[PDB]
Design a protein around this nucleic acid. Sequence first.
RNA 1: CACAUGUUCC
RNA 2: ACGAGACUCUGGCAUGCUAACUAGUUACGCGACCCCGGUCGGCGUAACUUCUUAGAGGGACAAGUGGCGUUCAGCCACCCGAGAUUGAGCAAUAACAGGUCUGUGAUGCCCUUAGAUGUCCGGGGCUGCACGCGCGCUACACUGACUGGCUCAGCGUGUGCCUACCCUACGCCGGCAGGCGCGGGUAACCCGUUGAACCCCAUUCGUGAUGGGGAUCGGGGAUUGCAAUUAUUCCCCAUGAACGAGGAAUUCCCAGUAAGUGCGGGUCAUAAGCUUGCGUUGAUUAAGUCCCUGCCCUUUGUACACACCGCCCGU
Lengths: 132, 185, 114, 62
Amino acid sequence: GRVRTKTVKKAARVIIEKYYTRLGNDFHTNKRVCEEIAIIPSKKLRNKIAGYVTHLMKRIQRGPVRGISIKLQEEERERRDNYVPEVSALDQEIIEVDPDTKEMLKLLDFGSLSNLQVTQPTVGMNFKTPRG
Amino acid sequence: TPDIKLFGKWSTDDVQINDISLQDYIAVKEKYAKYLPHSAGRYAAKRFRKAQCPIVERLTNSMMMHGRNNGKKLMTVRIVKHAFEIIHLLTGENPLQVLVNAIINSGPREDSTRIRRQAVDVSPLRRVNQAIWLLCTGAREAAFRNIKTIAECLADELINAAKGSSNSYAIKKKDELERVAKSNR
Amino acid sequence: VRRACYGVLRFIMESGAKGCEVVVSGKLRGQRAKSMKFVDGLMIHSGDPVNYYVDTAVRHVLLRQGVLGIKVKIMLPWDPSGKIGPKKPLPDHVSIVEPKDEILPTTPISEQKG
Amino acid sequence: QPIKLARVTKVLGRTGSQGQCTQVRVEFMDDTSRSIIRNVKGPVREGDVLTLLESEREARRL
RNA sequence: CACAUGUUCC
RNA sequence: ACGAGACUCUGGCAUGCUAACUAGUUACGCGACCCCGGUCGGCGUAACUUCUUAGAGGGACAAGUGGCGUUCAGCCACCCGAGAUUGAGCAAUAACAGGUCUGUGAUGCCCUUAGAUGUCCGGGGCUGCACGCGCGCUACACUGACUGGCUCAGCGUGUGCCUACCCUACGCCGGCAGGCGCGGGUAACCCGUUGAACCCCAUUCGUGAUGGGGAUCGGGGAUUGCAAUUAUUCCCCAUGAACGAGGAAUUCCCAGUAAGUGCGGGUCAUAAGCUUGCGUUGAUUAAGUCCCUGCCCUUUGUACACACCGCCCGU
């Protein structure tokens, strides 16, 4: 029956999204941290709020969490989302071209190409699902 | 004696537990030894905290019945302690062994219940619950309006139950309940 | 009875209230007894804070047709000084201080002086 | 007709009209291979053996 | 397996 | 946004902190008594806060592990642990022709207002009894009754602005109820170390409407009050009835819980079978279900809307 409400959870994310380095993993450690970085009115809530923080710390060390704004993971996500491989996914030497979309270029301007070799046609129209 | 225990003067050892179906629900030896059949309590809070209780304390916990005698464990231990000698001065053997054959032989196997009745099997903990119960109310009428005291009736029945001699209340009500279940089975 | 009940509901918002529950019971416009209810803003009902966050006043008015009941209920605002309301904060509000803007060091330097 | 040692090895669910019975996937200490389903009364634990007065009665899965 | 009915100024 | 939660008071653990000649202990030193030791709420002293008490704090979070779960919300299990759900209070939106005009100097309106439905004095009634019903109490016995002995509590209250009326120790007188003389307590002080019952031990009875039961009723004696006859209560003796475990039916309850057992509070001049709290003895059973009784969401059906206790058809 021990299910936390919003004020246990909406507050604990503010503990993480602003104070990540000032905490650790153990409960009584960041229990003693959260008393000075957050004015919690009661003692039982003081054990309540920090208790959800350590449980979410057991998730951040293990994976990414949705409602979290941590400065060190997003820069890690930044460097993988500005990523550029030294070769492109377009710089290919063998551009396999279908026999019909060969024909469409012959009427257009770029009709005769160099690095474009042609395949063989698939025999027998069989492409949609059997009904039932 | 920090090695062995004497239940007043009764030895802890040499009680073979006959049935293997109830031996996981008879706490009577080498982990469950007490000088008294009386602890502070605490056994009746959890679901299966009733499984490791000493059986002689369980009977006293079920003996304080019918109003006026509820909340009087000080005297029901004064009944069974007197009643343990009564078994010994009739048998000569361990009186607690007689209790082992008593709870084994007075627990009904199959029991009808409201489902039209479907006769179904029972739990060993249900079985030790009923076997200790049916004798505990059987002697409750044997001393009722009779010169035979409650100490003897408590001792007389499990003597008649360890042999299944069918002159005790607990044996009769076990086989009738096994038979009326055998009707709608 | 409508115009006057706003006259106290607005008089506290110029005075800086947190919320109010004004209810005018009694008979109005006929023989039948009814109840007016103009609630607005934040206003709590439960908890120990009801003693020191809400100040309750109930009065009666004498007229020719009946006796009307008024519950002038006001939720006090909060102040850490404690001169407009209670000193104690809410049981659920979590005052979290902002992190101070410190620039992380990359160089090991000493500042011996004296 | 035999007294048989049938070891309760897992519980399925509470049954009956008032929820006074529970159904168990019971197994036999007397031979491991055959195993049936049968309602039990009273509080049930895991790994206890039962005493079947008859062995051919099987309960239906609710 | 059975289990019908209603009193109403407001 | 409210309600739930949070919150409050209490319950449990901290030989750490703060201190107690109206709280207790530890010693030391005599007195008494038995064979250096033993005991004592006998008597003083300096060190202490263990017990006394209550102030601050500290302690528990699903915290750690192991399963389980989107591996999210969470759940089951283990260990460490004084606690791995103490109990209550507070408690919304809307609603009822719920109840109170017998709580009022809260009141609209109405009746009455001197031969008064106002006020006071006397006495009676509210207690009255063929009968039905509700909450209760003591019982129906031998796990008992009866008689000695032994021994354990925790909640409270006490001298009244009026108020002339308190809680009570001690010392006597009397079988008892009760009575008389001193002393203290406006209270952690005196009562009071609150010597409670149940209990425990040991008699006696012996399945008998008996020594279970104490209804009814006669006789005597004291208290309170101006006044007790329709017996205010109370003690003594004698009387000793129904009642042999309670049909149909139905109530309350899952942990110090039910029940047993007493003790204070309220009413109180006289006064608890009621009620409100307290401690004491201490469980059986259960860790489940929608069967019943209802209750909360979702769909669906509705000829219902004072709403199925609805509506309505034919003779």
